[PDB]
Ligand binder design. Structure first.
Ligand SMILES: CC(=O)N[C@@H]1[C@@H](O)[C@H](O)[C@@H](CO)O[C@H]1O
Ligand SMILES: [Ca+2]
Length: 886
């Protein structure tokens, strides 16, 4: 007491008809707010700041509800003050929660679960407390600096206008890179020099200084870093991969180069990054992780990188000019785990709203990246504009002409402005495009000539418009704001069509990324139309894990394409995530520095020695087995690594964990298991190499994925035959297999769900609890249900980004299999026929849990012995001994 019965108002961001937000606070138990969408929270203003003692919640029925309650005394920070997570039914008495005299002017109530419906509701909410006499402040409006006003602009222009300064900056940065990669104590062992290009091509040199130091020349920062990398790999037996295992143990004495080497590349561009990489991998990266990535990029010859960092600020400034408040902009933009599909015009809103602090922090991060990219000579690919607008754009701008784009995986696509209109009509494409390109300038300045945009990506609608004309006008608009503009276009599943592409009047100022060149190349159509294009290895889909690579194709098809083309302007990587199969990515970028086919087998032999720091005949034998099995050339169509049955929704006839995935293992499982045996035999000798431990975990989890598929078959067979005792035994072994898998996965920091989640929760500084919880939602949802019900199920996205991760395996994958198996067992045992399980309901329950109230996942890997774990797998849990195991 006392109850707050005067002056209290409420908002919501969605409701079903009739069931408006104000109905949560009208004193009437028979009327309710109800949610219409993925915003399932209301915000209550109390008409002043009160020290709260009690909050009372009534629901419309007797379902089981779960919810989190947040309070704010400053109007900005919403911190968690109470929650319901127990399985108690709601009833006519309501739920009463004690707060401990927390000051609050506003309250948020996020109802994350209703056992009866996808929709949530609040019939009534009563707030009790003592008036402080005070009122909330305003919220000051979102304010960001203009680039030209920042120290970043001064530095960018100085580098541009002063050669001596630029060279000193670059050379010093490359020295800083050496210190970060191998240690500060190695900086003075290298001398770096700028030189010119070799016959119009990027080039490096490595040689002896004459006094025991290493002289490295390069035409720019990336050539220099590539020379450093060449030295480490070829002379020091050192291998740098900050994401997927390194060997950084330097020799006692700096090895001599001997004969000087001069190495060039025939490719103008070496490209990195899918839009998807920004979501499946990079969602919650800090500057430390970005810096590491750029160092790896430069060392691997990368000079062209997709860049969407801080684009939310560009969009904010743009839409502010066409009748959108900052709050409406926040509702349009997705959450931090979904920018890939927001910028590809596939989805809106889901995962948001982003916090007010987001905009300045990301614009700063983007500026910081561009400074480092300038130093190295890496070209970012910024954004183009093709007509993307919110669905309410016409409501706010009545003369605008738009085309509804329909749905993508159950998400509402944003609208698209008609690229051209009739005489007499207002041309808002021209209006918004002009503003977009000018706002992008204001935020980041003139940092690139490369701009990426992709209308009609995985659907949409061209309406009444001419396809060729659409692409003509988009390109023309782009060139208008930058005369040297190059429109970077994705080639995905035969789109854009030839005659979209024939619409480009300036062929030399487009560049097409052939997205999937190592499995489904589609550059012939581009070469035929004199379109500059890049050969890309996609390789990774959704961050899904498993032993999978196409080394032979990379070693052969790339120089073959160069020899058989005139418009191949680069090679690159387009992975949906960067988390898997390091061999593939290293070989890909090595292929930039040759015009000839190489031997993928002897390449691998050299690769593993520098990756582990040592090699022997047996380790070589194990890797040849991998080359003969999991990494063997194939000629079919497939999307990513063969999926683990452990990660699939339980069921009969399972052929995949994800809708567009596959579970078929196209190589002999028992042959592959020999690699694990050899690794186990050599464990104690190689255990001081982290990259060896990484690879051992990779192949062993693959062994267990492979054998689980066989055990799953047997157990389904035992069901179908009515054999209760056999099903119990085989399903028991199947569950024990998953438990062993969890132990294997626990050995790697990169396989911990706790790191993914903690990164999300800590990615900004001075976040409130609201933002941390919402970002955790983004992290949990992306790797499981992806979206809500209509996206996971009807939309086909369920388990699209499934991960063979610790914590996730035990609490999510294992839990699903356990439930289904008890159900079948209960039936076999003279039971209750087994229920249909509403899988999404169970999955989302896990999605919505919070690290500070439910269960905190560890950020620390285990000490388990992979050699000993391999032994158990071979003995108990393998295809090889499966007949003796049963
Ligand atoms: C759900 C998902 O990630 N879909 C991606 C899509 O966003 C991307 O444009 C494309 C090409 O890389 O491939 C799909 O697999
Ligand atoms: Ca009511």
């Amino acid at each position: 007491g006392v109850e707050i019965t005067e002056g209290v108002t409420v908002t919501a961001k969605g409701n079903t008809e009739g069931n408006t937000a104000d109905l949560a606070i009208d004193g009437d138990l028979s009327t309710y707010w109800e949610s219409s969408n993925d915003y399932k929270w209301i915000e209550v203003d109390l008409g002043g700041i009160y020290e709260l003692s009690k909050i009372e919640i009534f629901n419309k029925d007797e379902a089981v509800y779960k919810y989190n309650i947040y309070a704010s005394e400053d109007g900005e920070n919403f911190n968690k003050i109470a929650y319901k997570n127990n399985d108690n039914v709601s009833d006519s008495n309501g739920n009463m929660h004690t707060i401990d005299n927390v000051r609050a002017g506003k309250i948020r109530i996020d109802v994350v679960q209703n056992s009866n419906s996808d929709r949530v509701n609040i019939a009534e909410i009563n707030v009790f407390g003592k008036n402080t006499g005070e009122s909330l402040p305003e919220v000051k409006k979102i304010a960001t600096s203009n680039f030209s006003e920042t120290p970043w602009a001064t530095e960018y222009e100085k580098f541009n206008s002063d050669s001596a300064y630029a060279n000193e900056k670059t050379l010093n940065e490359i020295k800083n890179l050496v210190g970060r990669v191998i240690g500060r104590e190695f900086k003075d062992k290298f001398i770096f020099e700028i030189r010119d290009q070799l016959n119009g091509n990027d080039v490096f040199e490595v040689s002896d200084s004459g006094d025991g130091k290493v002289l490295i020349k390069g035409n720019n920062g990336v050539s220099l870093a590539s020379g450093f990398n060449y030295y480490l790999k070829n002379y020091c037996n050192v291998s740098y991969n900050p994401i997927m295992g390194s060997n950084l143990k330097m020799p006692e004495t700096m090895p001599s180069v001997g004969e000087r080497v001069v190495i060039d590349t025939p490719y103008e561009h070496r490209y990195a990054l899918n839009f998807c990489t920004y979501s499946y991998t990079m969602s919650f990266w800090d500057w430390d992780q970005y810096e590491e990535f750029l160092d790896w990029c430069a060392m691997n010859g990368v000079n062209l990188v997709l860049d969407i960092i801080g684009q939310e600020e560009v969009l904010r400034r743009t839409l502010n000019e066409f009748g959108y408040s900052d709050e409406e902009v926040k509702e349009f933009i997705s959450g931090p785990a979904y920018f890939a599909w927001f910028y590809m015009q596939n989805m809106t809103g889901f995962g948001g709203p982003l916090p007010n602090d987001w905009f300045e922090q990301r614009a700063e991060l983007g500026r910081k990246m561009h400074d480092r990219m300038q130093s190295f000579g890496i070209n970012p690919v910024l954004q183009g504009y093709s007509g993307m607008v919110p669905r309410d754009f016409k409501e706010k701008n009545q003369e605008a002409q738009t085309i509804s784009q329909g749905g993508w995986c159950g998400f509402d696509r944003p609208d698209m402005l008609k690229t051209y209109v009739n005489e007499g009509e207002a041309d808002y494409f021209q209006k918004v495009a002009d503003v977009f390109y000018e706002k992008q300038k204001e935020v980041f300045g003139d940092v690139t000539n490369f701009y990426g945009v992709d209308p009609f990506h995985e659907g949409g609608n061209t309406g009444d418009l001419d396809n060729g004309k659409i692409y003509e006008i988009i390109q023309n608009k782009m060139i208008e704001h930058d005369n040297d503009a190059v429109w970077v276009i994705q080639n995905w599943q035969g789109n854009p069509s030839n005659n979209k592409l024939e619409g480009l009047t300036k062929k030399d100022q487009a560049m097409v990324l052939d997205l999937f060149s190592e499995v489904s190349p589609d550059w012939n159509r581009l070469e035929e139309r004199d379109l500059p294009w890049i050969w890309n290895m996609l390789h990774n889909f959704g961050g899904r894990m498993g032993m999978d690579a196409a080394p032979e194709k990379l070693a052969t098809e790339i120089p073959k394409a160069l020899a058989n083309s005139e418009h191949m302007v680069g090679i690159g990587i387009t992975p949906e995530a960067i988390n898997t199969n390091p061999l593939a990515y290293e070989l890909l970028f090595d292929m930039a520095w040759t015009r000839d086919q190489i031997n993928f087998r002897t390449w691998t032999e050299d690769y593993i020695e520098r990756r582990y720091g040592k090699t022997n005949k047996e380790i070589l034998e194990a890797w040849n087995i991998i080359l003969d099995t999991a990494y063997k050339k194939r000629n079919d169509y497939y999307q990513g690594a063969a999926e683990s049955i452990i990660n699939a929704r339980p069921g009969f006839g399972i052929k995949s964990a994800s809708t567009w995935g596959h579970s078929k293992i196209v190589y002999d499982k028992s042959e592959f298991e020999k690699a694990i045996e050899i690794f186990a035999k050599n464990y104690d000798e190689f255990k001081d190499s982290d990259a060896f431990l990484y690879d051992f975990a990779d192949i062993l989890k693959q062994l267990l994925a492979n054998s689980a598929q066989e055990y799953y078959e047997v157990m389904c067979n035992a069901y179908n035959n009515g054999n209760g005792e056999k099903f119990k035994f085989v399903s028991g072994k199947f569950l024990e297999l998953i438990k062993l898998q969890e132990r294997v996965l626990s050995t790697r920091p990169e396989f911990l769900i706790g790191n993914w989640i903690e990164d999300a929760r800590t990615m900004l500084k001075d976040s409130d609890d609201w933002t941390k919880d919402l970002f955790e939602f983004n992290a949990r949802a992306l790797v499981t249900t992806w979206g809500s019900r209509n996206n996971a199920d009807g939309g086909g996205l369920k388990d699209y980004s499934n991960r063979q991760w610790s914590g996730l395996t035990e609490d999510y994958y294992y839990a699903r299999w356990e439930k289904w198996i008890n159900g079948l067992q209960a039936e076999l045992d003279g039971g209750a026929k087994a229920p249909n399980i509403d899988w999404f309901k169970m999955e989302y329950d896990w999605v919505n849990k919070k690290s500070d109230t439910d269960k905190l996942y560890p950020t620390e890997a285990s000490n388990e012995n992979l050699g000993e774990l391999a032994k158990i797998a071979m003995e108990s849990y393998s295809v090889t001994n499966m007949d003796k195991i049963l």
